[PDB]
């Protein structure tokens, strides 16, 4: 049988600091650069694409992860770091550590984020061999989109200054979470934001006249559960578009070209590759998952 196998040789010993930072983390995900048995220390973590003196971003560093294949830890010996990678169809057992303790379940959908809560939380120091190992964070859908939801909010509002409670706290069901944003490189985030006028300006033109009329009937006297976001106040444009008699085959041919671009939003709202837990324990946190590249 096949044996995928990665073990990291080391030239100078783990210290008492980075032992307990790594002996405690016996199962997680960290990337690689090259697929071998052996590996130098300066290719393991997220610390290649990001560093301390280089101003990081929160887009391209995540976007870098789609290139790599990513591996699962096995052991932390005082010489070597023992790992194994992810075969395109094979089950494993991974058990997360993370100090933002989030609750998974069986039959979930997990991805891997770069650390957006706090960097010093994630950036461990390596006094022996210098090169830090920044840990990526294993994350489900409901969080994994919500911070990407949180990002494309804030880097618009990074210019609307030129504040803090409205624009960074991750509105999870139960808790809120401040991110770590002071000094970023938001120009790759500036692309994705200007990639929205590629869509959100252009999706607006072929909006049909029929479904817009439901908005005028809605907010007056037929108030629905979630729709109190409008707070009983229309947008100004809603009465400024509905002048058409509702011609049907116009709006038929409008919704076909609309229906194309909904699949186009996958290519701009991507995560990393995808995890398929089927069996899971909550008190143990160990899972059973096969690899799906995305």
């Amino acid at each position: 049988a096949l044996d995928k196998s990665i073990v990291v040789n080391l030239t100078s010993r783990l210290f008492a600091d980075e032992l307990a930072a790594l002996q405690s983390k016996i199962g997680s995900v960290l990337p690689l650069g090259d697929c071998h048995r052996l590996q130098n220390i300066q290719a393991l973590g997220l610390g290649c694409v990001c560093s301390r003196e280089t101003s990081p971003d929160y887009i391209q560093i995540m976007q870098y992860l789609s290139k790599c294949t990513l591996a699962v830890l096995e052991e932390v010996r005082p010489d070597s770091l023992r790992l194994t990678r992810m075969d395109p169809s094979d089950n494993l057992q991974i058990k997360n550590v993370y100090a933002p303790f989030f609750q998974w379940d069986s039959n979930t959908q997990l991805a891997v984020l770069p650390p957006l809560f706090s960097r010093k939380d994630s950036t461990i120091v390596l006094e022996s061999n210098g090169f830090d190992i920044v840990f990526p964070m294993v994350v489900p859908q409901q969080l994994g989109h919500a911070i990407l939801q949180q990002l494309l909010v804030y880097h618009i509002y990074s210019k609307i200054s030129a504040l803090d409670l409205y624009t960074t706290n991750v509105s999870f069901m139960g808790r809120t979470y401040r991110l770590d944003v002071d000094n970023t490189d938001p120009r790759t985030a500036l692309r994705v934001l200007d990639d929205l006028s590629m869509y959100l300006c252009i999706l607006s033109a072929l909006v049909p006249r029929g479904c817009l009329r439901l908005l005028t009937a809605l907010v007056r006297h037929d108030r629905h559960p979630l729709t109190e976001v409008f707070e009983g106040v229309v947008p100004d444009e809603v009465t400024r578009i509905d002048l058409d008699q509702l011609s049907v085959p116009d709006d038929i041919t409008r919704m076909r070209v609309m229906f194309s671009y909904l699949q186009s939003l996958s290519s701009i709202f991507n995560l990393g590759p995808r995890l398929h837990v089927y069996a899971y324990s909550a008190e143990t946190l160990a899972a059973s998952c096969w690899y799906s590249p995305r």
Partner: protein, 319 residues
């Protein structure tokens, strides 16, 4: 002789027995477990006889193929054996009918300019007619391109295996699911053949770091234009092992030249079918760190790969 010699194939080609270990009867548990490690001590040592018994262990190797039909004029009479294969469907003429398109074919389906492909225009002129060689059978070349519907009916198939060229019908057996085994030359598989006109590389730059692997992905794309105010497409290919979120933001940087002149046109006219742009298909993953082998045919510079597993994702829209 049949029981004598031909058994010694099948007396040896069998998979190994999953070895049975007796739990109870304690004098037979040790007789079992002793004959595991003496079987395991072979698979460690690099000596000669220890090697070849670590080779009967084999994974699942069985991809299935496709028996098609071709009107043998729509078949260009030769193929480089590793082409891409489309399957165009509008309506069934007979019971079991099919029509196929190669990457040399789709240049001859719009009558496009020689500026977008000055390499295969001299090539693919002798292989077919003058664009009307496939207009005899489909009177909907325009309206699929007009309404934005050509980019959905093409079903990506894969590479060839071997085709029998006859007088009226060319019988084509394509390849799917992975590794397409060749026929005339055994032990070597079907080398998928892409031209040097149509594959656009994504990696080239100054020296200025990227991760390697076993995974570079070939992308099947489609870019609209309207030359001479006529509906006309563009076959363009790619090669990139750099994830999905990057390349849709990189194909748009490649085809920025189309979009700039495009809305110079429809600034003063609104046709809702003229607003959709294109789609992406994924065909399979070449091992990244391998070689696109520059092979010359009929000129026609062609890249060819090795060990190409194949897949097919849906056509995903982009701008």
């Amino acid at each position: 002789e049949n029981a004598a010699r031909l058994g010694r194939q099948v007396l040896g080609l069998l998979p190994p027995p999953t070895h049975r270990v007796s739990l109870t009867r304690g004098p037979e548990f040790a007789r079992g477990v002793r004959d595991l490690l003496s079987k395991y001590a072979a698979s460690t040592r690099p000596t000669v006889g220890s090697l070849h018994e670590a080779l009967r262990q084999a994974p699942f190797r069985q991809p299935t193929y496709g028996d098609f039909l071709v009107y043998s004029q729509t078949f260009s009479p030769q193929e480089p054996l590793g082409t891409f294969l489309f399957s165009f469907k509008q309506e069934d003429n007979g019971s079991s009918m099919d029509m196929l398109l190669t990457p040399t074919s789709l240049f001859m389906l719009s009558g496009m300019e020689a500026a977008k492909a000055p390499q295969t225009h001299k090539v693919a002129g002798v292989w077919y007619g003058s664009g009307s060689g496939l207009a005899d059978f489909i009177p909907n070349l325009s309206e699929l391109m007009d309404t934005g519907e050509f980019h959905t009916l093409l079903t990506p198939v894969g590479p060839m295996v071997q085709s029998v060229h006859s007088t009226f019908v060319t019988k084509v057996t394509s390849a799917m699911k992975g590794v397409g085994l060749a026929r005339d030359e055994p032990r070597a598989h079907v080398g998928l053949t892409l031209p040097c006109d149509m594959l656009v590389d994504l990696d080239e730059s100054c020296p200025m770091r990227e991760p390697a692997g076993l995974n570079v992905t070939i992308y099947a794309s489609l870019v609209y234009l309207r030359v001479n105010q006529r509906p006309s497409m563009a076959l363009t290919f790619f090669q990139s092992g750099k994830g999905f979120a990057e390349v849709v933001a990189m194909i748009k940087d490649h085809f920025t030249d189309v979009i700039r002149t495009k809305y110079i046109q429809l600034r003063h006219e609104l046709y809702i079918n003229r607003l959709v742009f294109g789609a992406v298909c994924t065909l399979g993953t070449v091992p990244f760190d391998s070689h696109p082998v520059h092979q010359s045919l009929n000129s026609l510079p062609v890249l060819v790969f090795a060990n190409f597993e194949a897949a097919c994702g849906p056509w995903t829209v982009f701008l």
